[PDB]
């Protein structure tokens, strides 16, 4: 076993979850809902699709908006989150459609983006 | 950071692929930092390889995105960066633009050398 | 009109007999810290650098008058670099005050009152990115022909449209 923090974490959207099972991934989305026990939530990407986030301990911090999480793709087409961070949008909005287009670009020609 | 650690060292000037580089800039998230009487070292992570090291001579708190520009160094065959300046992002679209800037830059020169 | 410094230097720009204008985005690398400010005439317009009379009074040759006060002004030479090339350009008060994020008089006071802060201004302004509108023309001096570049406008960057243009160029260019 090796720590996932020191691996090439990929960046993807909700729609690609079916082809990256068990590998580390990086997910960007806007918060949608929180399971009432504070142990699950769901994010959405530019296309509007959704992916679920699972955790290990209850969350004592309220989180909303664009969310940044990293984890391992489980067998249920889900993300087993290890860490999360939330951007700052206090002065500008995040053009999430532009980021989705950029992410679509990376996997089109990975030679220039190893 | 994925392509920096893969750079060759010849006659004091580092090369990547078919292009030379001496001054570079990247964007990532701080992971940890320590204080020294003469300089500071940050572990900048951009989620495509292990946290690189950047050194600045005489502090941004952790988990913050930043943009850096500096020089590439090798010491005991270990890659590192010496940074002229480090600036936290304010608009979060900067790194989304940077992701496309990188693919444009490291793709335009390739055909020129062809 | 979108241009790249490499194409500017390699597509026959500025070599003509007329001042050509172009706009591009690039990062500021170096700022000339000395020989930037020259005392100027209190009148509203004069294409003349005042001359000192060494008695608390100044004279202007173009208008042939004398006043007891002078106005500071800015001429800045700066190097702009991109992912493929670099270029030298010169900035007057309008663009210089934008890039330095200060007015001419305040910087003039600072240089003669606080030199460390004067340097820090250039330091902070260094490595920033702006959208540059520049014009280039050939000037003949002592029988040498060379291109001089002057900055028209300085503004911050449009990240969204910049990314849209980049992605459109990438998709279009590759598929050719």
Residue numbers in the entry:
A (entry chain C): 1 to 114
B (entry chain B): 51 to 108, 119 to 174
C (entry chain A): 441 to 616
Article excerpt on this structure:
Instead, cryo-electron microscopy and biochemical analyses revealed that ssDNA annealing is driven by RAD52 open rings in association with replication protein-A (RPA). RPA associates with RAD52 at the site of ring opening with critical interactions occurring between the RPA-interacting domain of RAD52 and the winged helix domain of RPA2.
The molecular architecture of the human trimeric core was similar to its yeast and fungal orthologues, with ssDNA bound to the positively charged groove across RPA1 DBD-C and RPA2 DBD-D. Additional flexible densities, corresponding to DBD-A and DBD-B of RPA1 and the winged helix domain (WHD), were also observed, indicating that human RPA is structurally dynamic.
